[PDB]
């Protein structure tokens, strides 16, 4: 016997205050009981479980389940109750790698660590909580009692403890073999290297020799699946990667769940398929939770869906990462608050692609959305490559400099260059910083009655021009905006506007270029038409001439 | 130091479970090198999956330095750590530190690594060195000693720090010494010549009584810290626009100062006049403007620091590298106002400038009141949280919220 090192035990506890499970065993048929006795007998000879006395007060139900072609019985210990009372663990498997961050490996070997899974002992002070009972034939003897010595399948802590134990075992081997890479998920161990295929394998048995120190048998994985490897929904090929083939279903009736599975396909596809759009599709799922509800598609969802099928005609593939090359990201505006990007190192060979949708809000503009897309790509690139890409943006350097030097918020975009790809992001209007000499001055105001929702809006100017318009079903805030709209409509190309509306100032000073409010959108359309606009604010009800005159003209 | 101090969380609270945010390759490499050394020295130890807690970590380069410093964001753990008293009921903040001619700041956090931490509390200091692209499991550690940035570190170490400072405090009774987290604030009134060496006299003390960043000194001059009262223009000719902006400013100031009057100035704005037209002031308006100007010279009344409430700091971007800020606890009762300009190394980076403003305002807040303010930042959350760690140079971190609607108030501190 070659002495083997013990795998270090992880101490486990139940949640504070909680006790172990005490669930009663279900009645079983004589057939199932015989099945469970033979299996548990084998498992005891292997050391996985052990018989216990009657003093253990905990219990978890056990079942026996039949399969399809294999005319066998398999056990099933239902640890749902124990999992609720088990402490939380550090799950080291939240984020999976992204293929676009992986480097090329000439040789890759896949070994199975299933037999090694049972060499991981369970914390001794915790085993008592895993007790289960095999009921006896005809209930005429005491049921046979068992508890686990190893990590049980279906127990909360088994994935975390198994992965951590393997990592600790593998750590010195990887550290002293910088030429290879080792990646484990579930019960597969993937070993890659840029060593030629003969020299590569020698390191593989060197890993077997290292793993046998803890007595872990590791043979090659049964039926070496030849490329591509199907991993986490991807297709990993020697020189390229892609999503597993996506097929958009053909339907005449689209329901809630069909459209929810359709965004997932398109979202998953958008990482490598350029130009995917999902807004007018995602818009049909606003406030419904009946997954059988049928919804008629807009003519814009059909146009968007048909555009997606055209992009999905032929499969697209991405390249792997080369640290010696630069990292570049290019963004395009797609319309309706939708953006798409590509990340590459050499032209026309994308590492990956993606999309960005604008956040929910009443008013917005393109420069803010572009800035948000940049920050999302920056954070994604840090995750995948540990660095920020150089950006190619459809915005002129002069446009950006005007934007950030004048905007009331601090803002920043990392190193970038203009790329002329229409439609370009522009500033559609710019308010003046000082009053315009020789331009007419419009004092605007509006007011509404909250009882009747009747209101008035209008202006008076320094040239004697005046207008008051009566309005129905309106509010104080809408009449204040209507007054500004009227002044813009009736003025020349340059105009000074004086208002007391803090609400209107808050909107206009946010510099929106588009709004969901039709009235705000009309104001924007007027501002685009002007040469110069100076917007001045004054406090209401304060003896400010022109403002006082128009305030009582509109206050009925 | 061999016997630890018992420490607990606050009632009904578990440890922090805060996600680690993405780190660049160069910061990961620096953290790996730092933590490898700290592990050999016994300050931290690897942990297993039975520890579910986490606190974010990153790396910074302090001002005028070339080596990386580990920075743990203990903000959540500090919120959940019990309030400290132990030795005494608390040391009151020295109100004389802010009036000294020179204040030097020293990084003494390395001294904390000499005191062991309660072995029951250690699990709550868990942190993760992430890997690029999640290609390896994150390296998990916990602290065995008092960690830099934890609220409990200066409190537990306070007794030891007093005994080390006592020979120097006895010699110099005019030197104010204040401790905030990992920072030692040493204020004197003598000139800069050998204030540096008297601060160097502090360095050999801790050196012989017990460092990677001890050699540096952050020099301040709080006696020359300028305030920004409310100022009205002085003009010979006032346009309609000028008077309109003045009435708006005075109407805002009337919420702060009693007896502000604008009715005489509003009478000049009688009629529908062009904004650029010059209006001669009447003497009743000239008199009203003079009385308002006098009111605005005296301080605001009923303004006191309440140590039970939070300090709020608001910041406005004024353009051309200029930033204004106000510190208060209740609206319209500012405890401190100020203005910055020419943030070095950031003429074309708004976020870098804002990040330096936040650090300078926090430093001033520590000197004046001994705690940090909660910031209202004129920036979108996603922009700030992407970039602020790239320009951070302090060893503490304040709290912040984000302003999304443009305040009308920026014009009246302009
Ligand atoms: C994340 C991940 C998933 C799987 C799967 N399932 C496998 C591995 C090894 C893996 O981990 C890494 N995988 C890469 N590269 C990938 C593997 C190699 N293929 C190309 C290829 C070549 C030749 C063949 C062939 N001979 O048939 C077949 C395919 C590219 C993707 N590189 C680095 C790591 C890594 C792991 C741990 N620490 C650091 C880095
Ligand atoms: Mg009005």
In this structure, the answer to whether residues B289 and B144 fall within a common structural domain is no
Instruction: Report the structure determination method.
Output: X-ray
Rounded to whole angstroms, the Cα distance separating A180 from A190 reads 10
Are residues B237 and B301 both part of a single domain? yes
Same domain (yes/no): B230, B266: yes
Tell me whether residue B1 is in a domain: no
Residue B170 belongs to some domain of the structure: yes
Q: CA A367 to CA A339: how far, in whole Å?
A: 12
> What is the number of helices (H) and of strands (E) in chain B?
9, 16
**In angstroms, how far is the first alpha carbon of chain A from the final one?**
103
Co-location of B80 and B155 in the same domain = yes
d(CA B141, CA B32): 11
From the list B369, B363, B99, B368, the residue with the least C-alpha distance to B223 is B99
Domain boundary (B192, B219, B246) is at B219
Residue-wise burial string across B178-215, b where 16 or more C-beta atoms lie within 10 A, e elsewhere: bbbbbbbbbbbeeeeeebeebbeebbeebeeeeeebbe
Q: Is B406 within 8 Å of A10 when comparing Cβ atoms?
A: no
DSSP symbol at A240? -
∠ Cα A383 A385 A389 (to 5°): 100
Is residue B372 domain-shared with residue B385, that is, in the same domain?
yes
Nearest-by-Cβ selection for B267 from A405, A461, A543 = A543
Task: Tokens for B267, please give them.
Answer: 């009478």
A183 phi and psi, to 5 degrees? Answer: -135, 130
B342 in the same domain as B279: no
Can you give the residue range of the structural domain that contains B125? 6-95+121-161
Give the torsion through C-alpha atoms of A344, A346, A349, A351, to 10 deg.
-30
Distances (CA, A) of A89 to A156, A166, A387, B50: 8, 16, 30, 5
Tell me which residue of B273, B248, B406 sits closest to A539, measured CA to CA. B248
Which of B251, B270, B305 corresponds to the end of one domain?
B305
CA distance A507 to A523: 11
Does a cis peptide bond (omega within 30 degrees of 0) precede residue B335? no
**Min Cα–Cα distance to chain B from A388, Å:** 8
Which residues in A lie closer than 8 A to residue B412 (C-beta atoms)? none
Residue B311 lies in a domain: yes
For residue B401, the SS3 value is: strand
Which residue stretches of B348-400 are H helix?
Answer: 350-369, 381-387
**Separation between Cα atoms, residue B54 and residue A115, nearest integer Å:** 32
Distances in whole angstroms, Cα of residue A535 to Cα of each of A164, A453, A546: 63, 27, 15
Six-digit token string for A360:
């929910």
Q: Are residues B23 and B143 in the same domain?
A: yes
Does B374 fall in a domain? yes
For residue A190, which atom of ligand 1 is closest to its CA? 9
Residue B43 lies in a domain: yes
Do both B334 and B364 map to the same domain?
yes
Are B51 and B138 contacting, i.e. CB atoms less than 8 angstroms apart?
Answer: no
Question: Which of A500-504's residues contact partners 24+ apart within 8 Å by CB, and which partners?
Answer: A500/A445, A500/A537, A500/A538, A500/A539, A500/A540, A500/A544, A500/A547, A500/A551, A501/A446, A501/A477, A501/A537, A502/A537, A502/B408, A503/A477, A504/A477, A504/A480
Closest ligand 1 atom to A192 CA = 9
Q: Are strands B278-279 and B238-239 parallel, antiparallel or unpaired?
A: antiparallel
Whether residue A506 and residue B406 make contact (CB cut-off 8 A), yes or no, is: yes
- To 10 degrees, the CA torsion angle through A306, A309, A313, A317? 130
Cα(B283)–Cα(B33) distance, integer angstroms: 74
- Is A112 annotated in a binding site? The answer is yes
Cβ-defined contact of A506 to B50 (cutoff 8 Å): no
> CB-CB: which of A96, A410, A549 is closest to B354?
A410
Interface touch B24/A386, C-beta < 8 Å: yes
Q: In whole angstroms, how large is the CA radius of gyration of chain A?
A: 34
In a domain, B77, yes or no: yes
User: How many angstroms separate the first and last alpha carbons of chain B?
Assistant: 54
The protein residue whose alpha carbon is closest to atom 38 in ligand 1 is B135
Considering every ligand atom, which ligand is closest to the CA of A483?
A: 2
Ligand 1 neighbours (beta carbon < 6 A): A 97, 102-103, 105, 107-108, 181-183, 190, 192, 227, 229, 231, 236, 238, 320; B 135-136
Looking at the structure, do residues B27 and B144 belong to the same domain, yes or no?
A: yes
Cα separation, A458 vs A391, whole angstroms: 47
The DSSP H or E segment spanning A115 is: helix A114-117
Cα–Cα distance measured from residue B185 to residue B181, given in angstroms and rounded to the nearest whole number: 11
Task: With CA atoms as reference, report the closest residue to B8 among B89, B150, B124.
Answer: B124
- What is the Cα–Cα distance from A391 to A463, expressed in whole angstroms? 51
B23 and B142 fall within a common domain: yes
CB A262 within 8 A of CB A246: no
Q: How far is A212 from chain B (nearest CA, A)?
A: 22
Substitution target from B14, B30, B39, B48 for chain A, most A beta carbons within 10 A: B48
Residues A222, A115: Cα–Cα separation, whole Å: 13
Q: How far is CA B26 from the centre of its chain?
A: 26
Task: For residue B355, report the distance from its CA to the centre of ligand 2, in Å.
Answer: 40
Structure tokens at A517: 């409010």
Angle between helices A476-490 and A547-554 (to 10 degrees): 120
Rounded (5°) CA angle A489-A494-A496: 85
Beta strands in A387-479 (DSSP E): 390-393, 416-418, 440-448, 455-461, 466-471
Coil, strand, or helix at residue A319?
coil
Tell me if A115 is assigned to a ligand binding site.
no
Torsion sign (Cα): B171, B174, B178, B184: negative
Between the CA of B332 and the centroid of ligand 2 the distance, in Å, is 25
User: From CA B256, how far away is CA B306, in angstroms rounded?
Assistant: 19
SS3 A11: coil
The closest alpha carbon to A157, from A216, A215, A214, A84, belongs to: A84
B174 in a known ligand binding site:
no
Q: What is the 3-state secondary structure (H, E, C) of B46-66?
A: ECCCCCCCECCEEEECCCCCC
Diameter over CA atoms, chain B? 82
B113 DSSP assignment: G
Identify the three-state secondary structure at position A487.
helix
How many structural domains compose chain B?
4
Query: Shortest Cα distance from B20 to chain A (angstroms)?
Result: 11
SS (H, E, C) A243-280: ECCCCCCCCCCCEHHHHHHHHHHHHHHCCCCCCCCCHH
Q: Report the alpha-carbon distance of residue A293 to residue A326 in Å, rounded.
A: 49
As given in the structure block, the two tokens for residue B174 are 């005019």
| Contact predicate B249/B232, CB 8 Å | yes
Rounded Cα gap, residues A187 and A119, in angstroms: 13
Resolution in Å equals 2.0
> Strand, helix or coil at A461?
strand
Closest CA to A183 of B24, B16, B131, B230: B131
Claim to verify: residue B45 and residue B139 sit in the same structural domain: yes
Best of B25, B132, B134, B135 for a ligand 1 pocket test (most atoms within 8 Å of beta carbon): B135
Strand order in the sheet with B44-46: B44-46, B139-143, B127-129
Q: Are A516 and A522 in contact (CB under 8 A)?
A: no
Quote the tokens at residue B155: 């409190």
Q: Which residue has the tokens 């400013």?
A: B249
How far apart (Å, rounded) are the C-alpha atoms in residues B154 and B161?
9
- B10 lies in the same domain as B151: yes
Q: Which of residues 103-162 of A touch B (CB under 8 A)?
A: 157, 160-161
Q: How far apart are CA A542 and CA B165, in angstroms?
A: 61
CA-to-CA distance for A190 and A386, rounded, in angstroms? 23
Which structure tokens are listed for B67?
A: 């080596």
Residues 6+ apart with CB under 8 A from A170: A182, A184
Q: Give the other-Cβ count within 10 Å of B232's Cβ.
A: 14
Q: Which residues contact B203 (CB under 8 A, 6 or more apart)?
A: B106, B214, B215
């Amino acid at each position: 016997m070659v002495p083997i090192s013990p795998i270090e035990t992880v101490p486990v506890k139940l949640k504070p205050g909680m006790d172990g499970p005490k669930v009663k065993q279900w009645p079983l048929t004589e057939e199932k009981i015989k099945a469970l006795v033979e299996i548990c007998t084998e498992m005891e000879k292997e050391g996985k479980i052990s018989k216990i006395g009657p003093e253990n007060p905990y219990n978890t139900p056990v079942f026996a389940i039949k399969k399809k072609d294999s005319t066998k019985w398999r056990k099933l210990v239902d640890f749902r109750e124990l999992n609720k009372r088990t402490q939380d663990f550090w799950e080291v498997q939240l984020g999976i790698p992204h293929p676009a961050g992986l480097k090329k490996k000439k040789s890759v070997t896949v070994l199975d660590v299933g037999d090694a899974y049972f060499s991981v002992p369970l914390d001794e002070d915790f085993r008592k909580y895993t007790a289960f009972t095999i009921p006896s034939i005809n209930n005429e003897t005491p049921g046979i009692r068992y508890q686990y010595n190893v990590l049980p399948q279906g127990w909360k802590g088994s994935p975390a403890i198994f992965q951590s134990s393997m990592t600790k075992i593998l750590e010195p081997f990887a550290a002293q073999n910088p030429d290879i890479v080792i990646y484990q998920y579930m019960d597969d161990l993937y070993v890659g290297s840029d060593l030629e295929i003969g020299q590569h394998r020698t390191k593989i048995e060197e890993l077997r020799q290292h793993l046998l120190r803890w007595g872990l048998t590791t043979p090659d994985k049964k039926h070496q699946k030849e490329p591509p490897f199907l991993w986490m929904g991807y297709e990993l090929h020697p020189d390229k990667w892609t999503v597993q083939p996506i097929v958009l279903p053909e339907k005449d009736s689209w329901t809630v769940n069909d459209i929810q599975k359709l965004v997932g396909k398109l979202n998953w596809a958008s990482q490598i398929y350029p130009g995917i759009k999902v807004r007018q599709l995602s818009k049909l799922l606003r406030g419904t939770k009946a997954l059988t509800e049928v919804i008629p598609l807009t003519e814009e969802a059909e146009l968007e869906l048909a555009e997606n099928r055209e992009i999905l005609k032929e499969p697209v593939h991405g390249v792997y990462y080369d640290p010696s090359k630069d990292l570049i990201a290019e963004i395009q505006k797609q319309g309706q608050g939708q953006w798409t990007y590509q990340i590459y190192q050499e032209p026309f060979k994308n590492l990956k692609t993606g999309k960005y949708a604008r956040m929910r809000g009443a008013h917005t503009n393109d420069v803010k959305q572009l800035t948000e897309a940049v920050q999302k790509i920056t954070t994604e690139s840090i995750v995948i490559w540990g660095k920020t890409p150089k950006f190619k943006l459809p915005i002129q350097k002069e446009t950006w400099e005007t934007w950030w030097t004048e905007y009331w918020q601090a803002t920043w975009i990392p190193e970038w260059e203009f790329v002329n790809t229409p439609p370009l992001v522009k500033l559609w209007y710019q308010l003046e910083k000082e009053p315009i000499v020789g331009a007419e001055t419009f004092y605007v105001d509006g007011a509404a009655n909250r009882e009747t929702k009747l209101g008035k809006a209008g202006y008076v100017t320094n040239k004697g021009r005046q207008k008051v318009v009566p309005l129905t079903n309106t509010t104080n805030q809408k009449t204040e905006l209507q007054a500004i709209y009227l002044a813009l409509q009736d003025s020349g190309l340059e105009v000074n506007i004086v208002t007391d509306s803090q609400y209107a100032l808050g909107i206009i000073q946010a510099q929106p270029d588009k709004s969901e409010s039709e009235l705000v959108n009309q104001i924007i359309e007027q501002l685009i038409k002007k040469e110069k606009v100076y917007l001045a604010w004054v406090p209401a009800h304060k003896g400010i001439g022109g403002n006082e005159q128009v305030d009582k003209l509109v206050s009925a | 130091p061999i016997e630890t101090v018992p420490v607990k969380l606050k009632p009904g609270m578990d440890g922090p479970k805060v996600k680690q945010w993405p780190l660049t390759e160069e910061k990961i490499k620096a953290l790996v090198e730092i933590c490898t050394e700290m592990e050999k020295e016994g300050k931290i130890s690897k942990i297993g999956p039975e520890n579910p807690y986490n606190t974010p970590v990153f790396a910074i380069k302090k001002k005028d330095s070339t080596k990386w410093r580990k920075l743990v964001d203990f903000r959540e753990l500090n919120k959940r750590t019990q309030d400290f008293w132990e030795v005494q009921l608390g040391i009151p903040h020295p109100a004389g530190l802010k009036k000294k001619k020179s204040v030097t700041v020293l990084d003494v956090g390395d001294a904390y690594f000499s005191v062991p931490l309660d072995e029951d509390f250690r699990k709550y200091t868990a942190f993760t060195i992430p890997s690029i692209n999640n290609e390896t499991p994150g390296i998990r550690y916990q602290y065995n000693v008092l960690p830099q940035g934890w609220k409990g570190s200066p409190a537990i170490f306070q007794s030891s720090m007093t005994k080390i400072l006592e020979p120097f405090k006895k010699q110099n009774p005019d030197i104010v010494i204040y401790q905030y987290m990992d920072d030692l604030y040493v204020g004197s009134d003598l000139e800069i010549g050998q204030h540096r060496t008297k601060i160097e006299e502090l360095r050999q003390h801790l050196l012989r009584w017990g460092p990677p960043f001890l050699w540096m000194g952050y020099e301040l001059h709080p006696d020359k810290w300028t305030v920004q009262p409310i100022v009205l223009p002085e003009k010979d000719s006032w346009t309609v626009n000028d008077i309109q902006k003045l009435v708006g400013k005075l109407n805002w100031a009337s919420q702060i100062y009693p007896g502000i009057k604008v009715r005489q100035l509003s009478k000049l704005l009688r009629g529908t006049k062009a904004l650029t037209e010059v209006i001669p002031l009447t003497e009743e308006a000239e008199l009203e403007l003079a009385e308002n100007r006098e009111i605005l010279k005296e301080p605001v009344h009923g303004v006191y620091y309440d140590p039970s409430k939070d300090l709020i700091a608001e910041i406005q971007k004024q353009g051309q590298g200029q930033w204004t800020y106000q510190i208060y606890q209740e609206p319209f009762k500012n405890l401190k106002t100020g203005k910055y300009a020419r943030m070095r190394g950031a003429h074309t980076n708004d976020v870098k400038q804002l990040t330096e403003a936040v650090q300078k305002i926090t430093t001033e807040s520590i000197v004046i009141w001994g705690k940090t303010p909660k910031f209202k930042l004129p920036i979108q959350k996603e922009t700030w949280e992407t970039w602020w760690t790239e320009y951070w140079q302090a060893t503490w971190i304040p709290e912040w919220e984000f302003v999304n609607t443009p305040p009308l108030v920026k014009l009246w501190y302009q």
